[PDB]
Design a protein around this ligand. Structure first.
Ligand SMILES: CCCCCCCCCCCCCCCCCC(=O)OC[C@H](COP(=O)([O-])OCC(O)COP(=O)([O-])OC[C@@H](COC(=O)CCCCCCCCCCCCCCCCC)OC(=O)CCCCCCCCCCCCCCCCC)OC(=O)CCCCCCCCCCCCCCCCC
Ligand SMILES: CCCCCCCCCCCCCCCCCC(=O)O[C@@H](COC(=O)CCCCCCCCCCCCCCC)COP(=O)(O)OCC[N+](C)(C)C
Ligand SMILES: CCCCCCCCCCCCCCCCCC(=O)O[C@@H](COC(=O)CCCCCCCCCCCCCCC)COP(=O)(O)OCC[N+](C)(C)C
Ligand SMILES: CCCCCCCCCCCCCCCCCCCC(=O)O[C@H](COC(=O)CCCCCCCCCCCCCC)COP(=O)(O)OCCN
Ligand SMILES: CCCCCCCCCCCCCCCCCCCC(=O)O[C@H](COC(=O)CCCCCCCCCCCCCC)COP(=O)(O)OCCN
Ligand SMILES: CCCCCCCCCCCC(=O)SCCNC(=O)CCNC(=O)[C@H](O)C(C)(C)COP(=O)(O)O
Lengths: 120, 83, 127, 97, 111, 536, 44, 83, 77
């Protein structure tokens, strides 16, 4: 688990584990057909331990699930192309206005363009 | 393309219906997930399903801030890559 | 749409820069990258170099097992059930010249020893 | 922002240009602009084709002058139509054609 | 707020009194960043942070002097091989102590 | 007549890249394909004259390109049977890609510059192939290297693309440094740079190792394969050209042109590369990356076959020319699939109504890759596998490589067509014009002609092997295909992760080689010249 | 079943136009087979 | 080797040079490969159907030569006592 | 004058915030590790040097042994 995940509150930490687990189900699948049963299985895995109230056991489950989600990070995340980490992100980025263009550059003081040696 | 609120509302309402617990009239353009009857783990699934519906990737910290039907529509409207 | 897609601009530097900040490549778009990916920062698949070395340690003996038998354990007489291609004397003498030839392994020939020493030739030019 | 006066001399956005894509029209590049399609492109392509064929004729003369065949072809080759230095064909058996 | 300084016709005059900022060569100058400037200053004046430590001496010796020693040894070996190849007598190189005066081969001689 | 094709390609490059303002996007879309069509006619004439009718020609453009004392080299072109075949294959594929880029690159800003790069890229390949001496080959070699650098990094606002181009440039630099060493060796002890006087029956091992090290660069073999996978950052037309003919094949062409290789090294390296490429292509989830790893595996087969027999050079060239076709088709169809689905990941592809031509071309190219009987790829691959039986170690590894190749090829086919639709409910479309149909028709004509004309003279010559040995590759390919269709798990998650990281060759370079490189730079600069030797 | 009804939400993926057609992947294989059968009868 | 003597070489040096037969192909089968080569390059695209008799004859003679090679191998191996 | 140090937050909601930072210390390899890896890789670079050294030593040793045997044969005879 990263520092940002650790600093999160318990409710949001379990939410992060569920979100990352679902995304890793998507990454490790071969198609959308594999996703649904595996998503239901992850659903049941979280639902099984939701009613535990013993803090120490809950900490054990969260830590073990975080280790499992760290090990099964996919080498190739499935990311939409237009978003960060995507193929078409930055291919031809839209160029902004207010560009500093100097018109007729060579005709501004044409004879006296050059470097000068100034002395004391 | 900036997608108008009315269409985004229709599609978010369409996604929210598929939860069995949620009753088809409780979902309104302005309703929190709690009144709909959705849990936290359910809100994860709804945020993801919104990701397929509009073809976008929700960065996670914003995903936490989505807890209502209203703000989800606002986030989708804000996004210029939402389809 | 290939052209005109939205992009995130990397924030301007607001703190003193490290001396080796040249290791970071940033063109102004948000996801800047190391000069060589994997040199530092996030690792693809959360796999360290130790993991890859252990995996290679597992693989190499199995991959090398087919090669080691023929090259080392086997010998020219027992490698194959036949002798190399038989040629007329004029053709065979020319073909035996090639150090990278395939007639140098003909143990039936009376010039086998010289042919084998030709095959195991010089490492570097003498002159 | 009110477009500068020189914008009139600059050309418009082409049909192939996506409507959302913005580029600075003042930048000059020898390979062309961001989407080109200039007026008079057909005549320029015709001129380019004429130059290509004329250079092909010159290269053809040069190559034919410098094309050396020192071994007879096994059969008839198309070069015999245009170059006279082709040796008379001899087949695999050895008979001259 | 801006005006075109350059005139292709040749009637160019610099409007130092003009209310509008000329579009001169300084128009396209890069804005610059305070911390980047201090990084440039630090990197150029890296001799200020130079400290003689055993680690520094170790690095300098092992890489620089090591490469010099390796190159000198390789060059000496190549010279020895070439002397054997050419048939020359062992040449009196500067730091080699040889009791032979052979330095430059005689072109006229057959070796 | 022989010079004309190179003239046409370089004219297309100059016209589109320097006068493209006048020509326009349409002007490129005519002058490119028309010029390469004319070059295709010229290349067909060359192929008929040299290969079929056995008439080699030498054209000396000018003498004394470098004339310093004894060192003398001339700009000359010799079209020998190898050169004519490679020229025909290259020009055919490049004409197809130029037809392809008219519609694919219309949404790209600099289509004229892209066409100019593609045409100079082909021209330098033909200079490499037809050179009569080593220096002309080096010219073409460096020309294709620089053109790959300018084509992979076409998207300059992407850090990944420019870093991929830098990777390609650096690796290729090391390889040609080794080649230049071998060139100097051969000039010193043979008296010339020409291949005719280049012949040596016995060569010292150093020259052979230098030649092999130079060759494994462009023909990406093991420890030099890092750039090929990253070369996916470039546009799809670039990937087709580089993987099909221009870059990867050059090392094999050099090894076949000069038979200074050693049997022991080439066979082991090729078999290792084939197995590793198949294993890496197993894990990959981008459509484009799997095809690159398959290219690596096929290069491994071709390098391995040199060790087997005297006809190994002919078999390698035959597989080279056969491979260019269906591999180019696979990249072009994959690129069209990406455009239609706006996606690069195999999971979200699925069955969808499309053009019959593109799906058929994908199916037939994948069947050639698999080894489906009575196909051009089948013959050129069985010629290698059956003749490799004598080298027991090589044969085993190549048979497992055939299994892996079948598995991932069938998996890709099932995921692209048989699988249910996996992408989202959004309006996505790429309508194909008649030009793309002419492109795929040209590829399909190449594939069909390959069956009738063959790849090597000894292709159907008998290898005196038992029937169960001879027909074994078919059974291994069929088993791999059946396992791929079922999408079964073949390796544990640890080994799947290992293969997804491509063996960690790049992570080793990162952590040790690059860090040592920049620590040497730190010692050289900061400690020494701006340190010890800098005044206060 | 608890959770989002993923398969009902994505029941449009079985659209007639999103299904596999043998003709698209194998356009003229049947014609080749029929021609080979006729040529087989002739050759035999 | 002595027990299984080489066959007579039908193809002569001038014929092999006139057919441009590489030295690797000059293996007591050269005449048949001259036939196969001339017929293959005679029929550029129909050689697979037309040129089948010549290929068959070459493969037959090559099979006989391969049997001779295996016989030589067995004789040498039994002479050394390995079998 | 100087460029603004204020970032643009327009696209944070689309592409994520910039809060997360790199964990690298921007420091180089240790001196001890660098010594090992220089003295390992540089010899691998100079593989021709060792081949030439090996063959030259072999040639000189064989020549000297021939000379010694020649001296032995030319002493008695
Ligand atoms: C290779 C091996 C790796 C090299 C490094 C290994 C460790 C080096 C050990 C030596 C060392 O520590 O140096 C630090 C030391 C500097 O002290 P510091 O702690 O840096 O600060 C003191 C200053 O205030 C510093 O204040 P500053 O910052 O103002 O001064 C900076 C100054 C400080 O620099 C110096 O003071 C001397 C610079 C040259 C040193 C001469 C070579 C010393 C090392 C070579 C042998 C090392 C092997 C161990 O640097 C310069 O700007 C001058 C450099 C410009 C000229 C460059 C000429 C280069 C010549 C050789 C380069 C060195 C070899 C490396 C590359 C090799 C290329 C072939 O340098 C010396 O003291 C020199 C020692 C050797 C001098 C040679 C013998 C002198 C002859 C005297 C004869 C007596 C005559 C009797 C008659 C007298 C009456 C007239
Ligand atoms: C061999 C005999 C015939 C020689 C013909 C050679 C073929 C053409 C040679 C033309 C001159 C070669 C050098 C041209 C200038 C080098 C710069 C260049 O090629 O491209 C420029 C700009 O291109 C030009 O304006 C001129 C190119 C015209 C034609 C270039 C053909 C390819 C060059 C050939 C490689 C030179 C070989 C050198 C080694 C042998 C920069 O391109 P990018 O860095 O990719 O950025 C472009 C923008 N974008 C990000 C969108 C891609
Ligand atoms: C042992 C070596 C045996 C094989 C040698 C061949 C390969 C040697 C190392 C190859 C390095 C070349 C790769 C490269 O260019 O590195 C950077 C370029 O950046 C650099 O400049 C780093 C410098 C590395 C080059 C030199 C380091 C290796 C030197 C080898 C030996 C060191 C000292 C030896 C004596 C000098 C780009 O890599 P990526 O970040 O992965 O980009 C790929 C694309 N994508 C973003 C999608 C992942
Ligand atoms: C099929 C033909 C062969 C294909 C390539 C096969 C390569 C096989 C080489 C790997 C097998 C032997 C590895 C040596 C045994 C080490 C086992 C434990 C590894 C370990 O503890 O330290 C590692 C050292 O890196 C290392 O182990 C680097 C040693 C590698 C030797 C150089 C050989 C080239 C390797 C290129 C590909 C291999 C990638 C994986 C090595 C990680 O170090 P750390 O980062 O944790 O150190 C901390 C930073 N202070
Ligand atoms: C204070 C500053 C200095 C402190 C730190 C110094 C530490 C460095 C010491 C090791 C340096 C590398 C080893 C070279 C010196 C070895 C010992 C010198 C004695 C010697 O010449 O032996 C020869 C060494 O082999 C050779 O010819 C050289 C082989 C090693 C060179 C290749 C390895 C690196 C390759 C990188 C490229 C560098 C060279 C580029 C051309 C072989 O003996 P012999 O048969 O020649 O007879 C010559 C009779 N002694
Ligand atoms: C590709 C491979 C995928 C890897 C999958 C690995 C993932 C491991 C899964 C197993 C780890 C766990 O169970 S982690 C389970 C940790 N257990 C607890 O937190 C008990 C306390 N539960 C609560 O406080 C709430 O019920 C709460 C659940 C937060 C929701 O709040 P709501 O009541 O408002 O819905």
């Amino acid at each position: 688990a990263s520092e940002a995940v650790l600093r999160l509150p318990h409710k949001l930490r379990v939410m992060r584990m569920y979100r990352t687990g679902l995304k890793e189900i998507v990454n490790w699948s071969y198609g959308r057909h594999e996703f649904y049963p595996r998503a239901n299985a992850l659903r049941m895995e979280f639902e099984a331990n939701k009613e535990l109230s013993d803090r120490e056991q809950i900490r054990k489950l969260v830590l073990h699930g975080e280790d499992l989600l760290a090990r099964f990070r996919h080498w190739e995340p499935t990311i939409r192309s237009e978003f960060v980490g995507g193929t078409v992100y930055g291919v031809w980025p839209q160029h902004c206005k207010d560009v500093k263009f100097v018109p007729n550059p060579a005709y501004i003081d044409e004879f006296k363009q050059g470097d000068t040696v100034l002395l004391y | 393309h900036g997608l108008d609120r009315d269409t985004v509302t229709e599609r978010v309402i369409h996604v929210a219906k598929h939860f069995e617990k949620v009753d088809p009239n409780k979902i309104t353009p302005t309703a929190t997930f709690e009144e709909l009857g959705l849990d936290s783990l359910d809100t994860v699934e709804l945020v993801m399903a919104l990701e397929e519906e509009f073809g976008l990737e929700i960065p996670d910290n914003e995903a936490d801030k989505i807890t209502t039907m209203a703000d989800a529509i606002s986030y989708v409207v804000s996004n210029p890559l939402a389809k | 749409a290939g052209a005109g897609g939205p992009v995130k601009l990397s924030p301007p530097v607001d703190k003193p820069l490290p001396y080796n900040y040249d290791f970071w490549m940033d063109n102004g778009i948000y996801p800047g990258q190391p000069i060589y990916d994997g040199m530092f920062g996030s690792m693809v698949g959360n796999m360290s170099l130790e993991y890859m070395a252990k995996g290679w340690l597992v693989l190499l003996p199995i991959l090398s097992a087919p090669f080691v038998y023929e090259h080392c354990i086997a010998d020219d007489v027992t490698r194959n059930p036949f002798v190399p291609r038989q040629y007329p004397s004029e053709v065979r003498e020319f073909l035996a010249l090639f150090k990278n030839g395939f007639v140098l392994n003909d143990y039936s020939q009376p010039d086998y020893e010289e042919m084998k020493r030709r095959q195991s030739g010089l490492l570097t030019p003498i002159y | 922002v009110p477009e500068p006066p020189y914008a009139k001399y600059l050309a418009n956005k082409s049909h192939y240009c996506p409507p959302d894509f913005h580029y600075s029209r003042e930048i000059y590049a020898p390979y062309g602009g961001y989407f080109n399609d200039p007026k008079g492109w057909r005549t320029n392509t015709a001129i380019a084709t004429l130059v290509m064929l004329a250079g092909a004729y010159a290269v053809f003369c040069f190559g034919n002058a410098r094309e050396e065949r020192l071994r007879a072809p096994k059969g008839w080759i198309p070069s015999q139509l245009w170059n006279d230095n082709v040796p008379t064909p001899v087949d695999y058996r050895g008979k001259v054609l | 707020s801006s005006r075109i300084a350059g005139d292709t016709t040749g009637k160019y005059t610099p409007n130092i009194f003009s209310p509008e900022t000329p579009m001169d060569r300084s128009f396209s100058h890069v804005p610059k960043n305070p911390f980047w400037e201090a990084w440039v200053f630090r990197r150029d004046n890296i001799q200020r942070e130079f400290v003689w430590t055993w680690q520094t001496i170790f690095d300098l010796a092992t890489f620089v002097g090591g490469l010099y020693v390796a190159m000198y040894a390789t060059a000496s070996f190549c010279s020895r091989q070439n002397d054997k190849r050419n048939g020359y007598p062992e040449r009196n190189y500067y730091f080699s102590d040889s009791k032979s005066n052979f330095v430059i081969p005689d072109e006229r001689e057959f070796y | 007549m022989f010079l004309l094709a190179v003239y046409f390609l370089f004219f297309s490059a100059i016209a589109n890249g320097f006068f493209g303002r006048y020509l326009g996007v349409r002007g490129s879309q005519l002058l490119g394909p028309s010029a390469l069509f004319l070059a295709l006619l010229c290349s067909g004439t060359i192929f008929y004259e040299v290969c079929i009718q056995g008439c080699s020609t030498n054209i000396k453009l000018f003498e004394n390109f470098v004339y310093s004392n004894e060192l003398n080299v001339s700009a000359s072109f010799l079209y020998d049977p190898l050169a004519a075949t490679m020229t025909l294959t290259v020009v055919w594929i490049s004409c197809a890609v130029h037809a392809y880029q008219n519609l694919y690159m219309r949404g790209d800003g600099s289509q004229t510059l892209f066409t100019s790069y593609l045409s100079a890229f082909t021209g330098f390949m033909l200079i490499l192939v037809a050179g009569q001496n080593l220096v002309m080959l080096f010219i073409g070699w460096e020309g294709i290297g620089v053109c790959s650098y300018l084509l992979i990094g076409y998207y300059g606002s992407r850090v990944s693309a420019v870093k991929s181009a830098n990777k390609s440039l650096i690796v290729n630099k090391i390889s040609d440094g080794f080649l230049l060493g071998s060139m100097l060796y051969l000039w010193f002890y043979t008296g010339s740079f020409s291949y005719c006087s280049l012949a040596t029956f016995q060569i010292p091992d150093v020259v052979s190792i230098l030649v092999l090290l130079g060759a494994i660069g462009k023909s990406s073999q093991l420890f030099f394969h890092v750039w090929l996978a990253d070369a996916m950052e470039g546009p799809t037309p670039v990937s087709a050209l580089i993987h099909a003919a221009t870059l990867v094949t050059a090392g094999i062409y050099v090894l076949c042109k000069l038979n200074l290789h050693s049997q022991s090294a080439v066979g082991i390296l090729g078999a290792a590369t084939a197995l590793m490429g198949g294993l890496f292509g197993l894990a990959a989830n981008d459509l484009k990356r799997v095809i690159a790893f398959s290219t690596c595996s096929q290069l491994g087969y071709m390098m391995a076959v040199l060790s087997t027999c005297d006809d190994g050079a002919d078999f390698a060239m035959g597989h080279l020319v056969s491979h260019a076709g269906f591999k180019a088709t696979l990249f072009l169809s994959a690129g069209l699939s990406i455009a239609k689905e706006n996606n690069n990941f195999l999971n979200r592809y699925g069955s969808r109504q499309g053009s019959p031509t593109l799906s058929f071309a994908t199916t037939i190219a994948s069947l050639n890759l698999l080894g489906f009987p009575e196909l051009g790829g089948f013959y050129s691959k069985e010629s290698i596998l059956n003749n490799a039986y004598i080298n027991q170690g090589v044969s085993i590894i190549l048979t497992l490589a055939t299994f892996l190749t079948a598995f991932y090829t069938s998996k890709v086919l099932a995921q692209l067509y048989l699988f249910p639709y996996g992408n989202g409910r959004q309006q996505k479309s790429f309508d194909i014009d008649a030009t793309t149909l002419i492109c795929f028709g040209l590829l399909l004509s190449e594939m069909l002609l390959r069956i009738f004309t063959g790849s090597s003279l000894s292709q159907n010559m008998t290898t005196n092997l038992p029937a169960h040995i001879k027909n074994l590759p078919f059974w291994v390919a069929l088993s791999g295909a059946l396992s791929g269709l079922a999408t079964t798990n073949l390796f544990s998650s640890n080994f799947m992760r290992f293969f997804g990281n491509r063996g960690g060759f790049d992570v080793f370079y990162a952590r040790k080689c690059s860090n040592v490189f920049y620590h040497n730079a730190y010692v050289s600069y900061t400690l020494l010249d701006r340190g010890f030797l800098k005044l206060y | 079943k608890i959770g989002f009804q993923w398969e009902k939400y994505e029941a449009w993926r079985y659209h007639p136009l999103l299904r596999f057609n043998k003709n698209t992947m194998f356009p003229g294989v049947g014609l080749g087979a029929a021609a080979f059968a006729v040529y087989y009868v002739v050759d035999t | 080797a002595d027990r299984f003597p080489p066959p007579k070489m039908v193809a002569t040096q001038e014929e092999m040079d006139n057919a441009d037969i590489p030295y690797k192909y000059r293996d007591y089968c050269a005449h048949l490969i001259i036939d196969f080569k001339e017929c293959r390059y005679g029929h550029p695209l129909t050689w697979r159907i037309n040129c089948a008799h010549e290929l068959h004859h070459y493969n037959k003679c090559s099979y006989i030569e391969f049997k001779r090679r295996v016989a030589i191998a067995i004789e040498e191996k039994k002479r050394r006592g390995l079998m | 004058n100087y460029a603004s140090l204020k970032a643009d937050t327009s696209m944070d909601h689309v592409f994520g915030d910039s809060t997360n930072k790199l964990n690298y210390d921007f420091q180089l390899m240790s001196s001890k590790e660098a010594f090992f890896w220089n003295y390992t890789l540089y010899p691998i670079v100079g593989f021709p040097i060792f081949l030439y050294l090996y063959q030259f030593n072999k040639l000189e040793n064989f020549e000297a042994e021939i000379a010694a045997a020649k001296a032995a044969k030319a002493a008695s005879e």
